[PDB]
Design a binder for this molecule. Structure first.
Ligand SMILES: Nc1ncnc2c1ncn2[C@@H]1O[C@H](COP(=O)(O)OP(=O)(O)O)[C@@H](O)[C@H]1O
Length: 154
């Protein structure tokens, strides 16, 4: 796996901008597993991500008026046969209280990788850490970092 992904400059279809409310998941205490992920309300991503690749994306996101680099996993709801998109976001290097029922604004800037067949907790944790390291490296580039001041965040 490379330590950086995507073109030097943001390229279509990015940036993809959207907002959704942070709601609970199913019970996977990610927060305690040291890798807290915020589930986005399903109503906000159904049509928008329906034809986008499942996997891990990166970009910026804002909640409680603060902006953070982030990674986002996009998959399908396993509880229903009717294809239902799901998206969960992890704000990178954030310190603060929880933000359930809060509106998060997201700006997707690039794709990291497709979803891997679940191979256990340890592996999942490793992949997330690598994803974070790659996200930060990828947004170190000017064309990307400038979106941290995008009007959508104003
Ligand atoms: N950096 C962060 N990124 C994403 N969510 C965070 C972050 N820090 C705190 N949280 C909180 O962690 C929650 C998810 O963890 P958790 O409370 O254990 O619920 P779950 O069991 O569904 O994972 C989010 O809904 C959010 O309010």
């Amino acid at each position: 796996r490379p330590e950086i992904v995507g073109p030097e400059k943001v390229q279509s279809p990015y940036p993809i901008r959207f907002e959704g409310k942070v709601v609970h998941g199913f019970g996977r205490g990610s927060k305690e597993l040291g890798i807290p992920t915020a589930n986005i309300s399903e109503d906000a991503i159904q049509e928008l991500l329906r034809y986008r690749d499942s996997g891990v994306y990166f970009g910026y996101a804002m909640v409680q008026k603060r902006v953070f680099p982030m990674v986002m996993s996009v998959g399908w709801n396993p509880y229903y046969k009717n294809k239902l998109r799901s998206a969960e976001v992890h704000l990178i290097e954030r310190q603060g209280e929880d933000f359930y029922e809060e509106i998060m604004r997201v700006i997707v800037l690039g794709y990291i990788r497709p979803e891997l067949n679940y191979a256990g907790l340890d592996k999942l944790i490793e992949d997330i850490h690598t994803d974070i390291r790659v996200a930060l490296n990828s947004m170190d580039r000017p064309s990307y970092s400038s979106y941290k001041k995008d009007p959508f965040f104003k």
